[PDB]
Design a protein around this nucleic acid. Structure first.
Ligand code: MG
Ligand code: MG
Ligand code: MG
Ligand code: MG
Ligand code: MG
Ligand code: MG
Length: 360
RNA sequence: CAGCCACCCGAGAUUGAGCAAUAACAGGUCUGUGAUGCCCUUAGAUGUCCGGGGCUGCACGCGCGCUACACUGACUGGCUC
């Protein structure tokens, strides 16, 4: 194992390259499904429980994914699937470590998923004042709270929209993304291929996410994303009650979640922005009562524009794209050997490691 | 503990008044009284009636108010409590 590139969050704070044209499209694929306004309008004092739905996992690297593999080698040299540039676009916000694999084989610069002491699962309360103890195998332990959080954004995603109704079919099918056998539990989740200019052959073939579509008040296609939070043990991290405040002081709840979860919200915001979706839907999920997991209730959903909300997470897309360009610059000197980008967990500085003999 | 804050359900989670202590004030009223002490006046009456005048007088200084200075308006018509 070799050490190649190391940079702190301070350098990323002052890195910028505002060269992002209006994005084009390459191909859009994946059947969509409508939503229910009654499930949206569920509010505090009018509860509704959270059941379990079956999520067909569709996380795959670009190379193995057949739709990308029949388009990556044809044109373009810089490639990055969805929710993967957020790692490089949330460096100054993150405090933990993530792992990703950028392979500079020839002129190709395609990102891929890799695991080295960290996973892709949701991270909760990572950068908060007075962080949670996370000791042993407690209810608030990191892997188990993360597993609970991933449970929620897998189930409620498939519990807010009218899944049982006839799914609208886009013209192109999603090849090999849960298409080998029609399990009939294939969700509304569609994927777009879009290309935009950022620099030296950085026409980025990029996958997108659409967690559903919502019919307009006048009636037309309007894509949406469905992602949700989770409440637990309000005394910790200087929390606030959602069952008493969501109806009339929801702004404070958003404020304290932004204060508590910053890396996570930026991670979501990146995805919701690059997908070009119309509405971002944030569901509010809380435990039945304190100190009791495996039971949750959906306390409401809020609609905000993915761009306006990007302005309200004090995130600049300019410096984000610039730190992306600068990490590609730091990954331009490297060679055919791939690079596992493992940051330093205890002291947050970005790092990467060239893989010996193609280490995976 | 007396209590306080928020919320649910509720017509309503502080409706508004009347009455209102012990002590006082040289507070106001003798111009409310066939309530009243004392003093004054009592046939050219300060009783009472009639006629006329005045309270309203006008260089000025205050107090309670009404109408305004406009176009978020005035005028004309219509319609509705
Ligand atoms: Mg006196
Ligand atoms: Mg008297
Ligand atoms: Mg007379
Ligand atoms: Mg007078
Ligand atoms: Mg007066
Ligand atoms: Mg006039």
């Amino acid at each position: 194992w070799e050490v190649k590139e190391e940079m702190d969050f301070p350098q990323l704070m002052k890195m910028r390259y505002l060269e992002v044209s209006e994005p084009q499209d390459i191909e859009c694929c994946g059947a969509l499904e409508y939503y229910d306004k009654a499930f949206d309008r569920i509010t505090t004092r009018s509860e509704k429980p959270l059941r379990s739905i079956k999520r067909i996992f569709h996380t795959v690297t670009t190379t193995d994914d057949p739709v990308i593999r029949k388009l990556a080698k044809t044109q373009g040299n810089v490639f990055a699937t969805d929710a993967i540039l957020a790692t490089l676009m949330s460096c100054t916000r993150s405090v933990y470590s993530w792992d990703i694999v950028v392979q500079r084989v020839g002129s190709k610069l395609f990102f891929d998923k890799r695991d080295n002491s960290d996973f892709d699962l949701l991270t909760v309360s990572e950068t908060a004042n007075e962080p949670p103890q996370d000791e042993g195998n407690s209810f608030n332990s990191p892997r188990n709270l993360a597993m609970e959080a991933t449970y929620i954004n897998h189930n409620f995603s498939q519990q807010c929209l009218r899944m049982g109704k006839e799914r609208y079919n886009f013209p192109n099918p999603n090849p090999f993304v849960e298409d080998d056998m029609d399990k009939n539990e294939i969700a509304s989740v569609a994927y777009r291929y879009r290309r935009w200019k950022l620099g030296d052959d950085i026409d980025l073939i990029v996958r997108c996410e659409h967690d559903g579509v919502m019919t307009g008040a006048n009636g037309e296609v309007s894509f949406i994303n469905i992602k949700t939070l989770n409440e637990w043990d309000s005394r910790h991290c200087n929390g606030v009650d959602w069952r008493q405040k969501l109806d009339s002081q929801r702004g404070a709840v958003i404020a304290t979640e932004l204060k508590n979860n910053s890396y996570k919200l930026a991670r979501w915001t990146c995805c919701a922005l690059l997908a070009g979706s119309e509405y971002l839907k944030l569901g509010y999920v809380s435990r039945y009562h304190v100190k009791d997991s495996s039971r949750h209730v959906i306390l409401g959903t809020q609609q905000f524009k993915p761009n306006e909300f990007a302005s309200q997470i004090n995130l600049s897309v300019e410096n984000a794209w610039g730190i992306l360009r600068c990490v590609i610059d730091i990954c331009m000197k490297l060679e055919e050997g791939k690079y596992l980008i493992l940051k330093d967990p205890n002291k947050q500085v970005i790092r990467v490691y060239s893989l010996p003999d193609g280490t995976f």
